[PDB]
Ligand binder design. Sequence first.
Ligand SMILES: *[C@@](O)(c1ccccc1Cl)C(F)(F)F
Length: 533
Amino acid sequence: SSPPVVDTVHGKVLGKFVSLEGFAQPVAIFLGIPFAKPPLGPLRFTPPQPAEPWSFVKNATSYPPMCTQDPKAGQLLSELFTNRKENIPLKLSEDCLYLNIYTPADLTKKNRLPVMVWIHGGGLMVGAASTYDGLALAAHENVVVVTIQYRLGIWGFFSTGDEHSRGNWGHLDQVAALRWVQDNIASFGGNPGSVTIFGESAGGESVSVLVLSPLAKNLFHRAISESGVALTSVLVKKGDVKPLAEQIAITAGCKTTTSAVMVHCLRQKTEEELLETTLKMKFLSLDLQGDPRESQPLLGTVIDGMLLLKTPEELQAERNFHTVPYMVGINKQEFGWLIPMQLMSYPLSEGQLDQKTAMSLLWKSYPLVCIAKELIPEATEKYLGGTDDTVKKKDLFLDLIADVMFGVPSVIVARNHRDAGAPTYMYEFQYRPSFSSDMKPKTVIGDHGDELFSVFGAPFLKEGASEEEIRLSKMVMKFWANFARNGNPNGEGLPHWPEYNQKEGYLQIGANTQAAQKLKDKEVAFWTNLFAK
Ligand SMILES: *[C@@](O)(c1ccccc1Cl)C(F)(F)F
């Protein structure tokens, strides 16, 4: 019964025990541990500072707020992605730099378990750590699971393109959480010499950015990007970021006289005024009015000169990144339902698409796929021209967006990582979880986020999982935690997962799981040639 109490650098923390049926050792859970000073007032749009130390024992048994964000979209994504039986309602706050810890170690003995640090998705605009319950993965695989938060949206990524607001505050928060883990996780039974970062969607892009950042040197030892990398271009702003900053300033009621003037004005706004600004900007929603080249669907990663010194393409060309073991994976249908239908309000209710509407829509999709207008016909013809059925054309259009956004970027990242001599692994995930939304057509399989339910052991926390689904989660969890332990997912009882080498082996994960070769090879060739003009 007696709750666990752990000493950290900054003070003592009190957690709680939670048992998972069939595991003798209850899991010690610590909710809402601060890893930075709350980024309020003048600390807005600045790097995170260390948390101030506290006397006595901090009660770490309540979920922290989630970072300020569109509450409706944030709650929706939490409901769609959570592995728990009931979604936990969360408060909003700028005071959100917290992490949650699930340790299966008996804290009365000494333990050095591998640590897995989860970075949540959400487009860099929404999301929360508390969505993801670490209980099942921690108990089933004997790993310490850490879920982190980081500033989002305007708070996390507002950039003037210069020294007055460089940008990438949320990525700096991720780095601060990893340094906290280095300094403290051994008190929770974890091994700071074996930290694996893993994340999905914008969280997978964050993992890829951290692989590219000198600030993350020696903070992690393996990495996993699930459905998102630093070549997912909608998340990485190149070129001139000043137009977006000025539009944000104006919407908030601020002058644009200079960068410093904009940033100081935004620093005086209340949280509520910046949230009103966020909602007026209509982020994460396909912009159908005006020139598509001016659409800004999210505030994201920039080349700031501190976290990222050059573009991801330039960094991989010079082999300037952390050559840790790296697992890069995609799902069979990344654009099948949840991103267009639930997050971005795509005009695809009809379920048939003719080629003319497809070209018009692909042009409107410019902020996602970056295809010049003169190249829209060729691109569309390559995917939709081979059939005459317009339902098939709609499905092939979804394939096209998925390949440009996720599949091709992921293979290019994996190839460049392999070519720097690092151990590299890839997967393609194909399963339709029973936990899918009731709104989701039964023909969508391997949608964006579908692997989450297997990675986080949803069949052991939510009800109604089939026996096949339970088996799948046990295998995925074991692959992931073997990778955390050894930088190699393989082990006894598991299908062989080849290294992604020059033969380009990868694992097809699903009801039938087996190795395959050359993922997306034809598509990479096509799109690389197309984007070279
Ligand atoms: C992902 O973070 C996401 C959302 C929108 C665009 C791109 C990406 Cl990677 C989410 F939200 F989980 F789907």
